[PDB]
């Protein structure tokens, strides 16, 4: 009862790229770039594809940084999200009907307009730590319970 997703963070030494989602799941928040892994597709290939579709950027090197499972009470399917980061990209970010990308200085990450769990694991991401997390949500705004631990192997 878990569905595979990817999430990609473009993280450079002084800034991170986030995309304001205009519609659908996560609309109105600054998100990384991700989505469902397809049939016959590797998780990493899925991550590379989502980054291109949503941001217009071509990734070169992708690095595994975490796994987060999300539970929404009242929803049977868990999201099994494989989180990646990259500092090595081609292209310039593209604004589309679906997504408005913007660069943020690392001290100006807009956590109040991001998914609430980001506040918990972004600090780890920023310091190049790897992690496993689980967040139980009620609706899209309330974290009921969570676990988060650093790991050596994602
Ligand atoms: C920084 C960031 O994006 N954080 C972030 C936080 C999330 N929190 C809860 C559920 C999903 C989240 C997602 C997410 C992950 C993969 C696919 C999709 C559609 C979404 C909404 N991303």
UniProtKB/Swiss-Prot annotation:
Chain sites annotated for binding 8-oxo-dGMP: 6, 21, 31, 115-118
Broad EC category: hydrolase
Amino-acid positions noted as binding Mg(2+) 2 in the UniProt annotation, renumbered to this chain: 50, 53
Impact reported for residue 45 to P: Loss of activity
pH sensitivity of activity: Optimum pH is 7.8-8.2 with 8-oxo-dGTP as substrate, and 8.0-8.5 with 2-oxo-dATP as substrate.
Example of a GO cellular component annotation carried by this entry: mitochondrial matrix
The keyword Transferase appears for this protein: no
Outcome following mutation: residue 115 to A: Greatly reduces or abolishes 2-oxo-dATPase and 8-oxo-dGTPase activities
Mutagenesis / variant outcome for changing residue 38 to P: Reduces activity by 97%
Regulation of protein activity: Inhibited by 2-oxo-dADP and 8-oxo-dGDP.
GO MF entry, a single one: 8-oxo-7,8-dihydrodeoxyguanosine triphosphate pyrophosphatase activity
Mutagenesis / variant outcome for changing residue 115 to Y: Enhances 2-oxo-dATPase activity and greatly reduces 8-oxo-dGTPase activity
Keywords: Cytoplasm, Hydrolase, Magnesium, Metal-binding, Mitochondrion, Nucleus, RNA-binding, Transit peptide
PANTHER family in UniProt: 7,8-DIHYDRO-8-OXOGUANINE TRIPHOSPHATASE, OXIDIZED PURINE NUCLEOSIDE TRIPHOSPHATE HYDROLASE
Subunit structure comment from the entry: Monomer.
Protein name per Swiss-Prot or TrEMBL: Oxidized purine nucleoside triphosphate hydrolase
Organism: Homo sapiens (Human)
Chain's gene name: NUDT1
């Amino acid at each position: 009862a878990s569905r595979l997703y990817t999430l990609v963070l473009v993280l450079q030494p002084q800034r991170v790229l986030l995309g304001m989602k205009k519609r659908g799941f996560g609309a109105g928040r600054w998100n990384g770039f991700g989505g469902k892994v397809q049939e016959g597709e590797t998780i990493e290939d899925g991550a590379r594809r989502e980054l291109q579709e949503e941001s217009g950027l071509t990734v070169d090197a992708l690095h595994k940084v975490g796994q987060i499972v999300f539970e929404f009470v009242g929803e049977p399917e868990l999201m099994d999200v494989h989180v990646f980061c990259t500092d090595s990209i081609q292209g310039t970010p593209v604004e589309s009907d679906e997504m408005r990308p913007c660069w943020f200085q690392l001290d100006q990450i807009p956590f109040k307009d991001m998914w609430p769990d980001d506040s918990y694991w972004f600090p780890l991401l920023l310091q190049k730590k790897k992690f496993h997390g689980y967040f139980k949500f009620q609706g899209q705004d309330t974290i009921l319970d969570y676990t988060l631990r650093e790991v050596d192997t994602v």
